[PDB]
A = this chain, B = another copy of it.
Amino acid sequence: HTFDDIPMPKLADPLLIYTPANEIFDIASCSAKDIGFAIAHAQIPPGGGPMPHIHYFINEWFWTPEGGIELFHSTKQYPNMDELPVVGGAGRGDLYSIQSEPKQLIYSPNHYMHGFVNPTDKTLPIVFVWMRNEVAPDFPYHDGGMREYFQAVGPRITDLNNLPELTNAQRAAFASEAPKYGINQSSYFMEYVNTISDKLPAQIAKLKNDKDLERMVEVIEAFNRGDKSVTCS
C-alpha cells in the first residue's frame, strides 16, 4: 500500500526539533472545523527511532519515501492506558517487523503497540501524521497533543548544521512525560516486548485509512494557499 505525496505546511517560523529518540523533525500542527493533527517531515539517522510505545489520543500514519526504515507493530491492542504491558503485570507483547518500501503508507490505530528504527548506515526520510481521536483533550494546538509532546521534551534545532546534544534528562523525560500526552512510551527496547517476528500478519498489513489522510492533505494544501478556514502553526 502506497501513497504519492504528503506535503508540509509551510509555516513562517518552522518548528525544528531533535527528538530524544534521535529523530530530526520539521513539525507543525493543523486543524479545521472537522479535524486536528500534527505532521512531521523527519530525517532519521542510522540507529534513530523511538522505542516501542502505544498511543491513546491519536491515530498514526507513517510514510516512507525511500523505504529502508524498519517499523515494529503489534497485533494486540492495549485500550487501557493504566495497564502497562510489562513483566510486572499485564504482560509483554509480540511485535512484528515491516521492512518499508519506497512511498509505503502504514496506518496504526490508537492502542496498537509500535515503533521503528533506521537499521541502515544512511539517514532516511520519513513522514508522520498524528491525527486527534474522539477521546483526545484540547491541547493549545488542537492536534491531540503530539506536537506539544515533542516541543516539551526535545531540544529545538536552532542550527541544522550543529545538531543539539541530547542529555540523560531529555531521554528520561521522553519516557516519563509521555503519559501527559496520551503515550505509553518504553524507556528501553525490550521493556514492552516479548518477541520480534519477521512474519507480518495479514490483518496488520491490511490496515488503511486513506480518507482521513486525504482530508488532512486537503487541510495542509488549503493552509499553504492562504485559506483562512484552516490553521497551521
Contacts and interface: CB of A to CB of B under 8 A. Distances in A.
A3 interface: no
Contact of A195 (B88, B92, B196): B196
A119 interface: yes
A203 interface: no
Interface residues of A, number: 25
Nearest to A51: B189
A168 interface: yes
Nearest to A194: B198
A190 B72 CA distance: 11
A103 B152 CA distance: 45
Contacts of A120: 87-88
The complex is assembled from copies of this chain, and their number is 2
Interface string A167-193: 010000000000000000001111101
A155 interface: no
A231 B184 CA distance: 50
Contacts of A191: 47, 119
A159 interface: no
Interface string A85-124: 0111000100001000000000000000000010111000
A193 B193 CA distance: 14
Contacts of A189: 189-190
A165 interface: yes
10 contacts: A47-B188, A87-B119, A87-B121, A92-B119, A119-B191, A166-B168, A189-B189, A195-B195, A195-B196, A197-B197
Given A166-B168, A193-B196, 16 more contacts: A86-B121, A87-B119, A87-B120, A88-B121, A92-B119, A97-B195, A117-B188, A165-B168, A189-B189, A189-B190, A194-B198, A195-B195, A195-B196, A195-B198, A196-B196, A197-B197
